[PDB]
Structure 1
Amino acid sequence: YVICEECGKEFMDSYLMNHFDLPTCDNCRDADDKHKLITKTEAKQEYLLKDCDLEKREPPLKFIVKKNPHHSQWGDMKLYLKLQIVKRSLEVWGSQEALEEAKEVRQENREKMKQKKF
């Protein structure tokens, strides 16, 4: 049995455990706000994460493949758990302040590159 981190009620199988190894039952699964799923590109842009940080840094982060509503022939979106992405970003960059400084210096470097190109 697996004990939920929110209610503590024992359960055998749950969606979060099956898909992301998250010990949380479906009753406490707040997939709307707390357990929202984000696309891989969006997560990489927001948290400045790389492929190695997502697939090689232990523990590995699982994902759910879903069909693209806009175009059938286009790439299927890879959805990662927001909590796991946040935890991985905090572990890699140390603190949220480091990430907030990193995004600012990245946009400053982008502006520097565009003005240099001009």
Structure 2
Amino acid sequence: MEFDYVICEECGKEFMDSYLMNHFDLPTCDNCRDADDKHKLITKTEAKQEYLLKDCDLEKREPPLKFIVKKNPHHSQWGDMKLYLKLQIVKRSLEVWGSQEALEEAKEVRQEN
């Protein structure tokens, strides 16, 4: 219901909530999160064609990496799209297909069939 002791696991600052603790329930402030890439959320479809992930570390991780919603500025359903903690689907992706270089061979396994 309320939060008055959410300590960041990066700076260690006590606060009520932030960008990640607002809807991601992440114990980190907006001063430590690096949306540029670290916390840079990712597009669900992006985790499917970028990490070739399936119903495991996307919507079956239980919890399925907290997701969100926005309006992709590209040509897609920006009326109600959904995103996902990028850094989460990133680590899970490496353990999913193997790693980064491996993730590459994966994109080919999908562009080969």
Q: Point out the more displaced range, 76-85 or 94-103.
A: 94-103
Any unmatched runs of 5+ in structure 1?
110-118
Q: What is the CA-CA distance between 1:73 and the residue it aligns to?
A: 8.0
Structure 1 73/104 Cα, relative in aligned 2: closer, same or farther at 3 Å?
closer
Shift in CA distance, 105/70, structure 1 to aligned 2, threshold 3 Å: closer
More helix by share: 1
Equivalenced residue count is 109
> Which secondary structure state, in structure 2, belongs to the residue aligned with residue 77 of structure 1?
coil
Look up the SS of the partner of 1:89 in the other structure.
helix
* C-alpha distance in 1 between matches for 2:51 and 2:75: 27
Q: Which residue matches 1:35?
A: 39
CA distance in 2, matches of 1:72, 1:39: 11
Query: Is the CA contact (8 Å cut-off) linking 2:41 and 2:87 kept in structure 1?
Result: no
Q: Tell me, in whole angstroms, the C-alpha distance in 2 between the residues paired with 1:105 and 1:72.
A: 25
**Cα distance 1:21–1:88, how it changes in 2: closer, same or farther (>3 A)?**
farther
* Whole-angstrom CA distance in 2 between matches of 1:37 and 1:88: 14
Q: Distance in 1 between matches of 2:96 and 2:18?
A: 29
Q: 2:49 aligns with which of 45, 52, 61?
A: 45
Residue in structure 2 matched with residue 84 of structure 1 by the alignment: 88
8 Å CA contact 1:68–1:76 kept in 2: the answer is no
Q: Does 1:21 align with 2:25?
A: yes
Q: 1:13 to 1:103 in 2, by over 3 A?
A: same
Structure with bigger gyration radius: 1
Task: Say which SS state the counterpart of residue 66 (structure 1) adopts.
Answer: coil
Tell whether the 8 Å contact from 2:71 to 2:81 is kept in structure 1 after alignment.
Answer: yes
Superposed CA deviations along residues 31-55 of structure 1, whole A, max 9, x for unmatched, are 2332212221122100001234312
Partner of 1:98: 102
Q: Which stretch shows the higher mean deviation, 64-73 or 23-32?
A: 64-73
Give RMSD over aligned pairs: 2.7
Normalising by structure 2, what TM-score?
Answer: 0.74
Which string of whole-angstrom CA distances, capped at 9 and with x for unpartnered residues, describes residues 43-101 of structure 1?
21000012343121233212112245579986422111210110221232343343222
Q: Is the 8 A contact 2:70 2:78 kept in 1?
A: no
